Prior knowledge:
Blueprint: H1 7-10, H2 18-25, H3 29-48, E1 53-56, E2 70-75, E3 86-91, E4 95-102, H4 109-118, H5 120-126, E5 132-134, E6 143-144, H6 150-162, E7 168-175, H7 176-181, H8 184-208
Antiparallel strand pairs: 1-2, 2-3, 3-4, 4-7, 5-6, 5-7
Helix pairs in contact: 3-8, 4-6
Amino acid sequence: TQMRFTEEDFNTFTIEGLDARMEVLKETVRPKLTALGEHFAPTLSALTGDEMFPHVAKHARRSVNPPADSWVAFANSKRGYKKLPHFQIGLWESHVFVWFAIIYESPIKEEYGKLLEVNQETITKNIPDSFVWSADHTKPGVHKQSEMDKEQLKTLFERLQTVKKAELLCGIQLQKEEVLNMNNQEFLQRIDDAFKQLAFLYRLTQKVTQ
């Protein structure tokens, strides 16, 4: 099946109202998120060495506010993903994102933070300058690695262990124009390649999570 997002998928996030937007989202975006979940779960399991399970994002059951983005997450749990380091594939009306994430809900984000600060040279070395970072998955903004200061990436790890609502996300962005002009396989390959680059970040946390 086709998993690459088309124009009607990005445009779904412009529909006004929770009810109206949700009716379209369950028709355009969600089916593709679920397909992406079944497709990439085996891959991440093979890549990380841990059993990975897909989790399509919920909206109406969690918030009364219309979602500006949706995604499918992958974690080493069959019931959830928010409390563990995970991966994500999603989109806003402007772009598609692929993340390795540690969000506020993670009860042990303080340890991950101290561990990332100790491997800062290795992380900088293995994460391409074309990648991006984020301290909050609910805001579309990101920080480009190419224009990331050494102190900036360090403070980002520090705030992860200092500020309770600070997060850590690393991945890539595929602009709407790019996604609309590439084919399915090229789309799957961009995501697949990003997971290969992001895999070592999961392994670092793998150790601290016992």
